[PDB]
Enzyme design. Structure first.
Site, short mmCIF file in Angstrom:
data_model
loop_
_atom_site.label_atom_id
_atom_site.label_comp_id
_atom_site.label_asym_id
_atom_site.label_seq_id
_atom_site.Cartn_x
_atom_site.Cartn_y
_atom_site.Cartn_z
N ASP A 422 -1.07 -7.73 6.49
CA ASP A 422 -1.59 -8.33 5.28
C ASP A 422 -0.63 -9.41 4.80
O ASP A 422 0.59 -9.26 4.88
CB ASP A 422 -1.79 -7.28 4.19
CG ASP A 422 -2.91 -7.65 3.23
OD1 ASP A 422 -2.79 -8.67 2.53
OD2 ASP A 422 -3.92 -6.91 3.19
N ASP A 741 0.95 -3.30 3.03
CA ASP A 741 1.50 -2.48 1.95
C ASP A 741 0.49 -2.19 0.86
O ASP A 741 0.68 -1.23 0.09
CB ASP A 741 2.71 -3.18 1.33
N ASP A 745 -5.44 -1.97 1.49
CA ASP A 745 -5.28 -1.72 2.92
C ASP A 745 -5.38 -0.25 3.28
O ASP A 745 -5.02 0.10 4.41
CB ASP A 745 -3.94 -2.26 3.40
CG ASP A 745 -3.86 -3.77 3.35
OD1 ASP A 745 -4.35 -4.41 4.30
OD2 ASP A 745 -3.30 -4.31 2.38
#
EC number: 7.6.2.-
Length: 1036
Positions: A422, A741, A745
């Site tokens: 990400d 993190d 997600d």
């Protein structure tokens, strides 16, 4: 895919099954614990599900689940409750009983729940308790010790006791008990950690209908009940929707985010309630409510939606308790390898029987000693060594800052071939930062100033430091990270609102217009001592602000320069001011309309604030790309920003090409169309959004595998799309790592083979792997540790096999000449040497640098099997050379063949074979312990090196110095000293030969295998796709 099978009760069949299994034999119990479907079919009779008393669930794995009735017929499968719907004649999960009910339904239930209706819904939903099933030590022992491996160990203890080998039976029992104790320790540790993690019991006031308020325990809550929260706040016991009021919530316990979040009342409307759509209105179990404000009414009200395992924390805890089985079988052909060792063991056993008959030993002793020989190659320390390997891996990661809840998931780190990142928070800094400011001089932009501190005192600096909506809570600025970052950049300190100069007069906020999502801007009314009139400062979108600004103030380079900033991944906000002829006062400025302040502005400056890349991101990305591990960036941010970051962090090096894949929706009159947009600054990457990804998934299944194979940037994707991407990449036999993190997600981290969360605590629940460091340096650490763990477990299995075959050969050689290896010598070999060295072998850590070569995955590999066979050849050769060399000695006296061991001990043949083989165990232990590429060198392991040195010294003492341990071990005192030196020379020759053989195999054999039989292809779908794309590039 789930299958149910209802089995109604019947007493006669059950008692018949009971007596048959109990009296017949233990083999039926073994085949039942292997294949329980036959057992449940025999024990209980199939029947209608409406009459089920004991179900069977398939997912293919089998679980059997009792059905409980309260009349409510319910069962629990993996925490979740399923109930008997009489009308629908099926078992429905209670998580979906009220699924879909709208926000108006929630606001109607706001009044609370009737006590009787509460009682029925508590019967249905059960207590609001995430109950971790704790087991007593007898129960854990029964679960562990009933392993067929420990059953064979106990059978072996019986055989060795029969042969009057008491010390060796004690050795086997001690090693098996150590294995069992280690398993108990790890299992009970994990269970107790979970229990204290989910432990929660509070008194929460519930809004009973009729106007009264009721105080109950935390476990009493049921969905549809109405909570009232303390005004000062507290801990959240359930999963509720906020209906009236607002509250600060610290969701670090659930999501891992430390920042306070605004939770506002649920918006009334005819839309189905969703914990994701209405996330800003939903309070989650386990989170911390810093404060709660009752703007309307006397108290803040929430309505319980999910209790128990239905909550988000409940889902995470269930995923910890019942993890999805690991797809990867790291030990490919493990059963075939074990059978290849077992055929050699069977040949040795038939030879043993032949020679035992040839030695004229009684048949009962023949079968006893053949059974003992068979039990030799089943090492008691194999489970202990294999659990110790994972325990050491977990300890190493924990000392590095990485925490794994499933230590068997660590080996998947060495299997990773693709890692998804990400963008924000993980690859880039968590929030935006001041890279520059762009003041004006009339109608011309001034050169960029990197730091706004040295700007001269004036309207632009005051606009930077004041035009915001900060609120000093607990002497800590909170709110929009945009505003926080810009104000801390200005250096001014908050003190309506006043601000003190960093080093030059304090400035007050006469009035402030809060920011609106539709307005793309906000404004304030600002005055300071020494000011003739207040100045109104406006910050917002440059295009809209410039329109409100005077045209003679806005330079013509406005659009071109803003585009230049935007294309570089920046974020531009415009600063404007206008003098207000109103008198500077609190009352006068508060009556100014927003239209008056917003209109007729002057463009003083531009603010550019880009999201910086973390310093650790680029080295990690380039280290992964050097290792031929794909680095994919799966972000929800803009495509241009994503591409800029990807080119900046080394995912797309400048020599590489990047093609933006765009997909047009199949609107009326045309089908879906893919168009490729090349851009200038394995070597061809693709960039595509979330809409494009979904369009390709739906309408382009032929081109999807190529997109996934050569797709690097995945922008504008929703979390369900991230999960879908992880699953689609895994469909190509990738081993996907996800290092997002974020809380969004969560699905991707749960779906991915390795899911890492960056900024967590010791006790985090968000993903299987959690780290404490903010940088993605935890990804190469996980990969290095996983490769070390794979290499370490392979070395431990190799040493167990080598170990076992060596002791098997020793027992065969001693059987031939009608003797044995003696009681305390078995004890010494199996406990002092082998168990020590095997549990210290796995203590050496990963290599410091990640390398391109991947650890193997096949235990029956030609390299591994060739290593085992050629090591056993040298072991057998050295032992037989020593035995045939002690015969040639003049002082040698042949053993008393008439008696059987241990009656003829001590004897020279047993002495020589025990000495040689005891050295060979240490030699093999050091030989299987490879260092680079995947591990540190052997000598960095100080306990292991000390064990090898001390054990070699003790063995050399046994050989050389007379009378040392030759009484207990039953060693014949060899008087000759030249023969002792010759034996030590044979040991040295074996030690040199083992290492030279290992080096020669490791170096030459892969090259020889490649030259002899070049691989036709690779089974992996993604490697087939990569070769196919090399043959013909897809985007033309």
């Amino acid at each position: 895919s789930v299958r149910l099978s209802g089995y109604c009760g019947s007493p006669w069949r059950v008692i018949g099954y009971h007596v048959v299994v109990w009296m017949m034999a233990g083999i039926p119990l073994l085949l039942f614990r292997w294949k329980p479907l036959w057992g449940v079919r025999l024990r209980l009779r199939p029947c209608n599900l409406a009459h089920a008393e004991t179900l069977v669930i398939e997912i293919w794995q089998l679980f059997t689940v009792q059905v409980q009735t309260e009349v409510l017929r319910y069962y629990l499968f993996q925490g979740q409750r399923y109930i008997w719907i009489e009308t629908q004649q099926a078992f429905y999960q209670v998580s979906l009983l009220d699924h879909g009910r709208s926000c108006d339904d929630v606001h109607r239930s706001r009044h609370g729940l009737s006590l009787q209706d509460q009682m029925v819904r508590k019967a249905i939903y059960g207590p609001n308790v995430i109950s971790i099933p704790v087991k007593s030590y007898p129960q854990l022992l029964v679960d562990e010790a009933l392993n067929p491996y420990y059953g064979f160990q106990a059978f072996s203890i019986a055989l060795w006791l029969a042969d009057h080998y008491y010390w060796y039976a004690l050795c086997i029992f001690l090693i098996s008990s150590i294995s069992i104790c280690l398993s108990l320790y790890k299992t009970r540790k994990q269970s107790q950690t979970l229990r204290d993690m989910v432990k929660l019991s509070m008194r929460v006031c519930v809004c009973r209908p009729g106007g009264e308020e009721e105080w109950v325990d935390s476990s009493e809550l049921v969905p549809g009940d109405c909570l009232v929260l303390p005004q000062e706040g507290g801990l959240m016991p359930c999963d509720a929707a906020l209906v009236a009021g607002e509250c600060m919530v610290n969701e670090s316990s659930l999501t891992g985010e430390s920042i306070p979040v605004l939770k506002t009342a649920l918006p009334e409307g005819l839309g189905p309630y969703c914990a994701e759509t209405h996330r800003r209105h939903t309070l989650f179990c386990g989170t911390l409510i810093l404060q709660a404000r009752a703007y309307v009414g006397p108290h803040v009200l929430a309505v319980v939606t999910r209790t128990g395992f239905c909550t988000a924390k409940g889902g995470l805890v269930s995923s910890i308790l019942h993890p999805r089985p690991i797809n990867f079988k790291f030990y490919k052909h493990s059963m075939k390898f074990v059978a290849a060792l077992s055929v050699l063991a069977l040949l040795g056993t038939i030879y043993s029987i032949f020679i035992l008959y040839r030695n004229r030993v009684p048949l009962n002793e023949i079968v006893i000693r053949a059974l003992n020989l068979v039990t030799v190659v089943v090492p008691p320390a194999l489970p202990a060594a294999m659990t110790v390997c994972t325990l050491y891996a977990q300890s190493r990661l924990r000392r590095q800052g990485i925490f794994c809840i499933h230590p068997l998931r660590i080996n998947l780190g060495g299997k990773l071939q693709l890692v998804c990142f990400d963008k924000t928070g993980t690859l880039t800094e968590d929030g935006l930062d001041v890279m520059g400011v762009v003041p004006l001089k009339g109608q011309a932009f001034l050169p960029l100033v990197p730091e706004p501190r040295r700007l001269p005192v004036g309207p632009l600096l005051r606009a930077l430091a004041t035009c915001h909506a900060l609120s000093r809570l607990q002497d800590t600025p909170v709110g929009d990270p945009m505003d926080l970052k810009m104000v801390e950049s200005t250096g001014w300190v908050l003190e309506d609102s006043a601000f003190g100069t960093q080093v030059p007069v304090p400035v007050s906020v006469l009035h402030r217009f809060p920011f609106s999502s539709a307005l793309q801007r906000m404004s304030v009314v600002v005055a300071w001592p020494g000011a003739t009139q207040p100045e109104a400062y406006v910050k917002g979108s440059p295009e809209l602000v410039a329109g409100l600004c005077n045209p003679e103030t806005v330079p013509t380079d406005f659009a071109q320069m803003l585009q230049s900033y935007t294309a570089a991944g920046y974020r531009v906000v415009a600063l404007a001011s206008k003098p207000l002829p109103t008198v500077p006062s609190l009352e006068a400025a508060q009556q100014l309309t927003r239209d008056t302040v917003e209109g007729d502005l002057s463009l003083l400056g531009l603010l550019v604030m880009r999201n910086l890349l973390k310093p650790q991101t680029t080295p990690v990305i380039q280290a992964l790309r050097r290792t031929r591990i794909r680095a994919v960036m799966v972000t929800g941010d803009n495509l241009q920003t994503a591409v800029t970051v990807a080119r900046g962090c080394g995912m797309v090096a400048p020599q590489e090409h990047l093609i933006i894949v765009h997909a047009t929706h199949p609107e009326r009159g045309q089908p879906a169309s893919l168009e490729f947009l090349p851009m200038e600054s394995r070597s061809r990457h693709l960039a595509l959004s979330g809409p494009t990804f979904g369009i390709i998934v739906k309408h382009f299944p032929k081109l999807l595998p190529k997109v996934l194979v050569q797709g690097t940037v995945f922008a504008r994707m929703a979390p369900e799309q991230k999960t879908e991407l992880v699953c689609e990449l895994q469909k190509l036999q990738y081993c996907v790592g996800m290092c997002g993190d974020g809380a969004n997600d969560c699905g991707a981290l749960k779906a991915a083979d390795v899911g890492i969360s960056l900024s967590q605590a010791e006790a985090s629940v968000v993903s299987p792997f959690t780290s404490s460091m903010a940088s993605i340096e935890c990804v190469p650490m996980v990969i290095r540790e996983g490769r070390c763990s794979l290499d370490t477990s392979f070395s431990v299995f190799k040493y167990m096999a080598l170990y076992s075959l060596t002791q098997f050969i020793s027992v065969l050689i001693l059987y031939t000449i009608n003797t044995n290896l003696g009681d305390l010598q078995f004890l010494a070999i199996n406990l002092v040497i082998t168990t020590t060295v095997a549990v210290l072998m796995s203590r050496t850590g990963p290599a410091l640098v990640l390398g391109r070569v991947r650890p193997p995955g096949a235990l029956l590999s030609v390299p591994v099997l060739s290593s085992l066979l050629l090591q056993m050849v040298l072991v057998t050769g050295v032992q037989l050379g020593g035995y045939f060399l002690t015969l040639a000695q003049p002082w040698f006296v042949p053993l008393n063949r008439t008696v059987a061991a241990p009656d003829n001990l001590p004897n020279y043949e047993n002495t020589v074979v025990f000495s040689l083989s005891s050295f060979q165990y240490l030699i093999l232990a050091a030989a299987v312990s490879k260092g680079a590429p995947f591990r540190r060198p052997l000598y960095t392991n100080v306990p292991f090196l000390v064990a090898l040195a001390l054990l070699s010294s003790v063995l050399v003492g046994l050989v050389l110095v007379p009378g040392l341990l030759q009484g207990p071990l039953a060693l014949r005192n060899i008087t000759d000293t030249g023969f002792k030196l010759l034996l030590l020379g044979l040991v040295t020759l074996n030690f040199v030969g083992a290492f030279m053989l290992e080096s020669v195999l490791d170096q030459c054999l892969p090259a020889c295998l490649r030259r002899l039989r070049p691989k036709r292809a690779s089974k992996k779908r993604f490697k087939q796709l990569e070769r196919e794309l090399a043959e013909q590039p897809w985007p033309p």
